[PDB]
Amino acid sequence: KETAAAKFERQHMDSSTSAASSSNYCNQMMKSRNLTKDRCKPVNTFVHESLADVQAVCSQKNVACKNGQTNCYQSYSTMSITDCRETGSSKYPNCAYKTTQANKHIIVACEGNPYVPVHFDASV
Amino acid sequence: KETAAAKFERQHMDSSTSAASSSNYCNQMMKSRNLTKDRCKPVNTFVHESLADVQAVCSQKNVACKNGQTNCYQSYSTMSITDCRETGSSKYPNCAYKTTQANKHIIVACEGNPYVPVHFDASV
């Protein structure tokens, strides 16, 4: 099995680009990050900052997660992100996504030692 | 009981201001909208656009909701919003919130006839 930290990296980290390069970014990334195997993951956000900057969020603003848990953190600064969401033309195994680029604060849940992101909660 | 549409209005609509007026906006609004009765609602977003403009989102971009349901819609345009999230100093019945103002697309789930928003899913 994948560690929670490694799963967050696979699902949510893209430090190789400063932003989504095309409208096809999500189609390409949801597939290559293995989020279209066995099902179309409906919603997923990629963060275009260094892994260091995203891990650093775990020592930034402590906020409640949507589910009421207390181990969520909001980035002090805004970050380049891409939201990927399934569109009406999407049907497994032909998954289809809308790519929306934005600059927002990210909110992540953190766990472990080292204390690192394990869930992407929301962006603001 | 409250209708789903009326609950969305109470939880998510603030057409009376163009944006959050102070850092205390969420403390005031979470209380006056009855979201601190019986418990501190952990996370909640207010939309500073007309009710008409928010209802109109139900005929805009059809996208998957985070939970996989197919009745979510993303606003074509960005809207003035405020995210309210519980802080570490928060403890029922003294609920405490961080106010974060932003301009983003909203994603809402829609139901019924008339087809209107009944859940705030996310903003992008």
- Residue ranges per structural domain of chain A: 1-124
In the sheet that B116-123 helps form, which strands lie side by side, from edge to edge? B61-63, B72-74, B106-111, B116-123
* Domain A1-124 -> CATH class: alpha beta
Marked catalytic residue, from B119, B120, B121, B123: B119
Residue type, B104: K
> Which of helix, strand or coil describes residue A51?
helix
What is the gyration radius of the CA atoms in chain B, in angstroms?
Answer: 14
| Of A55, A51, A49, A48, nearest in space to A29 by CA | A48
Residues β-bridged to residue A109: A72, A119
Decide if A30 contacts A90 (C-beta within 8 A): no
Q: What is the C-alpha separation between A53 and A117, in angstroms, rounded?
A: 11
Read off the tokens for B11.
Answer: 């939880």
Top residue of A83, A89, A90 to mutate, by most chain B CBs within 10 Å, is A83
CA–CA gap between residue A115 and residue A59 (Å, rounded) = 9
Angle (CA) A24-A97-B76 rounded to 5° is: 95
Q: A101 vs chain B: nearest CA distance in angstroms?
A: 8
CA-based nearest distance A117→chain B, Å? 18
CA distance to A83, A121, B80, per residue, from B12 (Å) = 22, 19, 12
Binding residue numbers of A for substrate:
7, 10, 41-45, 66, 85
Contact B95, B86 (CB under 8 A): yes
Residues 6+ apart with CB under 8 A from A70: A62, A64, B88
Nearest 5°: CA angle at A20, between A118 and A108?
Answer: 20
A25 touches chain B (CB under 8 A): no
- CA-based angle A30:A86:B46, to the nearest 5? 115
| Two structure tokens written together for B55 | 């209802």
In angstroms, the first-to-last Cα distance of chain A is 31
Q: What is the resolution of this structure in A?
A: 1.8
Instruction: End-to-end CA distance of chain B: give it in Å, rounded.
Output: 31
* Closest chain A residue by Cα to residue B70: A88
